Amino acid sequence: MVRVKVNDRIVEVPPGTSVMDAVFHAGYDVPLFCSEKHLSPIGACRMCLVRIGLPIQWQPKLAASCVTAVADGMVVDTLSDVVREAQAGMVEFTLLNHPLDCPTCDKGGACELQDRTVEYGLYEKYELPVYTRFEFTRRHVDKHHPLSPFVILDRERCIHCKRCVRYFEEVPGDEVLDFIERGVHTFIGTMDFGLPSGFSGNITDICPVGALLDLTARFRARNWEMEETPTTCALCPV
């Protein structure tokens, strides 16, 4: 195994490990939008940035911890003003064109974007705090549109991770969802209208916000209000 030292804590960890896993493995944390258990990692949201030292010889630019491998005797700082200032900034770039639906949005208290904003954003520079810098016309597009009788799509809320389109290609293998235009103009869309595959409900639990939601259960209760009963699905042998 390889020796890594996160902040003030050192850990054993196999060679191939993502610095992101090594970070969490020491019991630390970092904003994390586009990466998902069991999917191909790519630094796309640019949230999981750390500072990396490797001889102490701080590398000049910040690394995407989720697609950076770990080297023997490496240091990882996740608390520096340099880190935290960058994070709060990246949280701001995200919320920039987002819609303002939280009360009405069914993605309630179970929304990664919400949790990560209140965790790592609005940075303390060292009276009256400034909540929003962007004062222009936010992005306006197609809203509350069902893709299938089981899945309803809010494009305005999408944060362009790749969680969904990635998954369709990788796990079941049914490329029925992709982005469209480009720039600030790009969006999720389909041409295979039904939402073909029989594994299309999974994108529902991954989507980090309330773009892709379970229509079978639209507008029933807020996520905390639900009592949750863990069990097994007996509809077949698996």
């Binding site: 790519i42 630094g43 796309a44 949201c45 640019r46 949230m47 940035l49 630019k61 910040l62 995407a64 697609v67 950076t68 491998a69 200032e85 960058a86 900034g89 990246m90 770039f93 995200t94 920039l96 064109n97 810098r133 962007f134 222009f136 944060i159 362009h160 992709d178 982005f179 235009e181 480009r182 720039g183 600030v184 103009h185 790009t186």
Partner: protein
């Protein structure tokens, strides 16, 4: 004279743009009559692949795509002998504003490019080669496909070249209008029939590029230059330019200057030389100049600038950098705020959309600041945010495009910050002078 080549010297030789503009320059006949695939034949029977790489390592050829990287050391990364198929890609997607040097090698001396790629593939054991040109370059596209055909006819392409057990074929692939497709790794995706986002590089193109395969990508200018180099020695090549910028370079210049265009000069020659001797000097008062591409930071119109040797170093340690050798002069009659109001709404357009900081960052916030302030709705707070924004972006996006955008804005605040303050504090719109005839 006595030592080194850095100007309107009398011992300098035009090699690339030699026959550009010459009537009928692109017939396989023209190319042959002026000693066509003479070099390529030589090299293939005589120098081995490894030997044709050292002659480029020694030439000191650095990449003309704007990258600047050591293109002899670049070929040095390719898998020696594994048995896999290897790929060579000419990057004739030339889309970075103010830059147009590739275009005319494509339209008027394509066989030079072809020969240059035969050499290139030979060095790296790539039997197959591709040319991704911009789907806007119409004549260029037609002259390449033309030439690729004449070459294939007369045995200069394909089967078994010159009797030697090497075979090499070219394929053209036109684009569809996307600057980002210029990025070496986004180009591969684009070509491969995917949406052209740049790839994750920790796995490198030399070890997995086009279709999983060991590929090497180079600029048109880089490749066209592999010929004279192999024709008349690295020593000939090195005998031009600075101590880190060897050889000659395709410099082009645009803006309100007397006679804009492409001028083949050696590495080192000064801006003052290009702007004046050749281009015929300005027609308006100038306030700044953009050295390499549009992606390079603007420098003030000063003597100490005019006398700087346009190089991968004198420019480097001068704030900016030498991109594509595409200079653009900007007249005082136009506001530097506007200049970039423009350039950044150019980048805003061209962003692939993969990164939060570029998609949302520059394409969202940045272009919108310029807007406000450039209409005279601007406040002093507006110039401060814009400034504080750049470092939240530049450091860390998925690819260079993001930097390409901030750099010119950084370097514009750092020399004209008063010009931004000016518009803001007096709620004044950028000046709208008559510019076209």
């Amino acid at each position: 004279t006595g030592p080194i080549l850095s100007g309107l010297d009398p011992r300098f030789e035009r090699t690339l743009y030699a026959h550009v503009g010459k009537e009928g320059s692109w017939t396989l006949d023209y190319y042959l009559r002026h000693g066509g695939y003479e070099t390529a034949k030589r090299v293939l029977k005589e120098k081995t692949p490894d030997e044709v790489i050292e002659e480029v390592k020694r030439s000191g050829l650095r990449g003309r795509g704007g990258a600047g990287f050591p293109t002899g050391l670049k070929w040095s990364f390719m898998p020696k002998d594994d048995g896999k198929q290897h790929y060579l890609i000419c990057n004739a997607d030339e889309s970075e504003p103010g830059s147009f040097k590739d275009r005319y090698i494509l339209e008027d001396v394509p066989h030079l490019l072809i020969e240059g790629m035969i050499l290139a593939g030979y060095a790296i054991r790539a039997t197959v080669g591709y040319i991704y040109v911009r789907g806007e370059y119409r004549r260029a596209a037609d002259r390449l496909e033309q030439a690729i055909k004449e070459a294939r006819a007369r045995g200069y392409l394909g089967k078994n070249l010159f009797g030697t057990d090497f075979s090499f074929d070219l394929h053209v692939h036109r684009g569809a209008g996307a600057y980002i497709c210029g990025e070496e790794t986004a180009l591969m995706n684009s070509l491969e029939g995917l949406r052209a986002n740049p790839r994750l590089k920790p796995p490198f193109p030399a070890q997995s590029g086009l279709w999983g395969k060991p590929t090497t990508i180079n600029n048109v200018e880089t490749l066209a230059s592999v010929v004279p180099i192999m024709e008349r020695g690295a020593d000939w090549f090195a005998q031009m330019g600075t101590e880190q910028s060897k050889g000659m370079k395709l410099y082009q210049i645009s803006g309100p200057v007397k006679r804009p265009g492409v001028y083949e000069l050696p590495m080192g020659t000064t801006f003052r030389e290009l702007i004046y001797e050749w281009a015929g000097g300005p027609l308006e008062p100038i306030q700044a100049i953009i050295p390499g591409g549009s992606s390079t930071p603007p420098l003030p119109f000063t003597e100490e600038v005019l006398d700087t040797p346009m190089s991968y170093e004198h420019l480097q340690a001068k704030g900016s950098m030498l991109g594509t050798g595409g200079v653009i002069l900007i007249p005082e009659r136009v506001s530097m705020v506007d200049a970039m109001w423009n350039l950044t709404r150019f980048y805003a357009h061209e962003s692939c959309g993969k990164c939060t900081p570029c998609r949302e960052g520059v394409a969202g916030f940045m272009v919108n600041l310029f807007a406000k302030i450039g209409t005279g709705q601007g406040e002093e707070k507006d110039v401060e945010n814009l400034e504080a924004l750049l470092p939240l972006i530049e450091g860390r996006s998925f690819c260079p495009l993001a930097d390409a955008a901030v750099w010119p804005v950084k370097g514009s605040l750092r020399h004209f910050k008063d010009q931004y303050l000016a518009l803001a504090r007096e709620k004044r719109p950028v000046p709208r002078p008559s510019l076209w005839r």
